[PDB]
């Protein structure tokens, strides 16, 4: 997050009388006076920009009120619960306060009402796979070994956009499942072809499962995408096992020839009733699974 | 008196350093996250917010079913035991916040505080050691590596239920299983260092490879 972070406080020692009430001074004056030692509790490695000069401004009013603004880039910790990934939403904190001065010495307030005291630029979004629904502003206390400190917090509420993972993982998995189910429509004597269907679809599902979690942390628990991939892999495995069961009951190694007439029960194999039932069962069960999955995962998060 | 942190540059402070440090810094936003607090009796409290990357040599023979001992080795650089004596203030309660750590891949079984004296050619120096025992979670690896290997090995047995004369189908099944195992091992390549010994996951994958290879040899 990139912020103009601006603080203000009254220093009675710095009152003055002159032609002009507010002295818009160089930022070098900031180092020559006391300023708050504000720091970000959950910050990881922040940058105070100093190109070309230190990106700060200090203004002293005649009554002793000081305004002090900085330009900062803070990369902060946002612990995530990825059980509902990619259908998950998060509330990333931004917590700041004095590092040295306890509540009995320094206290932080918001310049305006807390809702309006954090403003986001209209054009200021660099989120690719997230949407910033809004923010909530609050304050609290923290107890440490050194003392009690006021901690001013914001929480930015973000909702992941699902389109990337829909194109990356869900659609290839669905197409692999459909491709595996296509094998039910071939004649039972096409043993190498149906075996090719089964083995290639299992390979594709294994590759998709392996590469699905490339971008995530190595969390122990399973996610929604993990469950979806597991169910699709189960469907492909079941299709190949179904072909194996069909082939186990094939009596004759030759398929029907275009000229002969099959008697109704040289003889020929009949179309497998396993195949006939699978042609209806597998697509129907996959569709019902998709219905239940997308019904039970799309609407899970809190709403306003 | 909680003074501005720039007075630390004027005051004396211990020359503390972490021996197993690789890269570390004091946080510097909005200012240097440093604290100086003086007391009437001349007592000085000196606080710093430090992020440090510390070396931890990890034995991966039982990986991913392994536990690791990772330590931070606090020491005085220039002052021997005749000049400076370190101790853990508050005893075993000196280090706090370990219970709130929740790593995604590890669980902190326990932590230990040790105080000793380490001897070099230049003298004997005090040493404090903050050790953590970390136990690796297995669910991610079960999802990623073990279950696909088991499923491929199970699929390799389908050829036994196919007729001996269906050579194309049986050979395709065996070869595909071998290829998928090699692909799983490819993904195991892509996220580990070049250790010279076999791990537990390597043992499991080699066993599954031997099984699918033996199935193909059985058809042959």
């Amino acid at each position: 997050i990139d912020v103009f972070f601006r603080q203000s406080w009254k220093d009675e020692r710095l009152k003055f009388k002159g032609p002009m009430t507010v002295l818009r001074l160089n930022n070098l004056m900031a180092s020559k006076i006391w300023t708050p030692d504000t720091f970000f509790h959950n910050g990881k490695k922040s940058v105070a920009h100093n190109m070309t000069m230190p990106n700060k401004l200090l203004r002293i009013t005649e009554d002793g009120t000081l305004l002090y603004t900085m330009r900062l880039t803070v990369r902060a910790e946002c612990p995530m619960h990825l059980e509902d990934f990619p259908m998950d939403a998060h509330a990333c904190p931004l917590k700041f306060g004095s590092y040295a001065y306890t509540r009995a010495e320094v206290v932080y307030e918001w310049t305006r009402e807390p809702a309006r005291s954090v403003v986001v630029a209209e054009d200021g979004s660099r989120l690719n796979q997230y949407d910033l629904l809004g923010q909530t502003v609050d304050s609290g206390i923290v107890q440490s070994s050194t003392g009690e400190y006021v901690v001013m917090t914001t929480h930015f509420h973000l909702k992941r956009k699902i389109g990337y993972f829909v194109i990356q993982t869900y659609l290839p998995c669905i197409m692999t499942v459909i491709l595996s189910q296509v094998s039910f429509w071939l004649n039972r004597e096409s043993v190498p072809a149906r075996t090719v269907f089964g083995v290639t679809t299992v390979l594709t599902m294994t590759t998709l499962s392996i590469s699905a979690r490339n971008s995530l942390p190595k969390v122990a628990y399973a996610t929604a995408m993990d469950w979806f991939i597991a169910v699709c892999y189960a469907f492909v495995f079941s299709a190949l096992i179904e072909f194996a069961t069909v082939n186990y009951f094939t009596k004759r190694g030759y398929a029907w020839d275009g000229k002969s007439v099959v008697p109704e029960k040289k003889t020929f194999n009949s179309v497998s009733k396993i195949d006939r039932l699978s042609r209806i069962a597998f697509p129907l069960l996959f569709g019902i699974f998709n219905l239940v999955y997308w019904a039970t995962y799309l609407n899970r998060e809190p709403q306003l | 008196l909680t003074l501005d942190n720039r007075v630390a540059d004027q005051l004396w402070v211990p020359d503390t350093y972490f021996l197993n440090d690789k890269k570390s810094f004091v946080h510097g936003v909005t200012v240097k996250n440093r604290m100086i607090r003086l007391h009437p009796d001349g007592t000085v409290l000196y606080g710093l917010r430090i992020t440090t990357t510390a070396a931890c040599m990890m034995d991966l023979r039982r990986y991913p079913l392994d536990e690791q001992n990772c330590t931070l080795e606090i020491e005085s650089y220039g002052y021997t035991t005749d000049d400076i004596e370190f101790y853990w203030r508050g005893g075993d309660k000196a280090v706090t916040g370990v219970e709130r750590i929740e790593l995604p891949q590890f669980s902190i079984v326990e932590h230990r505080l040790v105080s000793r004296n380490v001897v070099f050619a230049t003298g004997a120096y005090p040493r404090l050691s903050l050790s953590f025992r970390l136990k690796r979670n297995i669910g991610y690896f079960i999802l990623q590596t073990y279950m696909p290997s088991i499923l491929i090995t199970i699929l390799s047995w389908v050829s036994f239920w196919i007729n001996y004369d269906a050579s194309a189908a049986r050979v395709a099944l065996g070869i595909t299983t071998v290829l998928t195992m090699t692909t799983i091992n490819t993904h195991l390549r892509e996220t580990l260092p070049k250790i010279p010994y076999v791990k537990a996951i390597d043992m499991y994958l080699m066993g599954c490879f031997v099984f699918v290879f033996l199935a193909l040899l059985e058809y042959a």
């Epitope: 509790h41 959950n42 612990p79 619960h81 939403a89 998060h90 509330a91 904190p93 917590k95 629904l133 809004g134 909530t136 609050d138 609290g140 206390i141 923290v142 107890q143 440490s144 901690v151 917090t153 929480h155 509420h157 998060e301 809190p302 709403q303 306003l304 | 219970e99 709130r100 929740e102």
Partner: nanobody, 108 residues
């Protein structure tokens, strides 16, 4: 009078979650009392700021609330909640897990 109400969680570690206390009086809506974050940061409602104290034992996966300076209009059902505070930290809708509730009555 003084009191201390404890809440212990089981079946899920709430170390990374936020643990809060709510209060429902007879005939009124649930009111946020206090909450503690993973960073040991404490939030309080204005009605009970400076009186009630929230704490967390992370090893035992529990949250405690010390109530001091009780008065007759503190009588209510006190609820324990845990969740990730989405749009919230002060709204009951942001907490996914809730306790059964414990009655508290103050008699003058």
């Amino acid at each position: 009078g003084s009191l201390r109400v404890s809440c212990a969680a089981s079946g899920r570690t709430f170390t990374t979650y936020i643990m809060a206390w709510f209060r429902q009086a007879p005939g009124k809506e649930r009111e946020f009392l206090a909450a503690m974050d993973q960073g040991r940061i404490q939030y309080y409602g204005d009605s009970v700021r400076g009186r009630f104290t929230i704490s967390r034992d992370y090893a035992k996966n529990s949250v405690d609330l010390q109530l001091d300076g009780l008065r007759p209009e503190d009588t209510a059902v006190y609820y324990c909640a845990a969740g990730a505070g989405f749009w919230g930290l002060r709204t009951a809708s942001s907490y996914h897990y809730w306790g059964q509730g414990t009655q508290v009555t103050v008699s003058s």
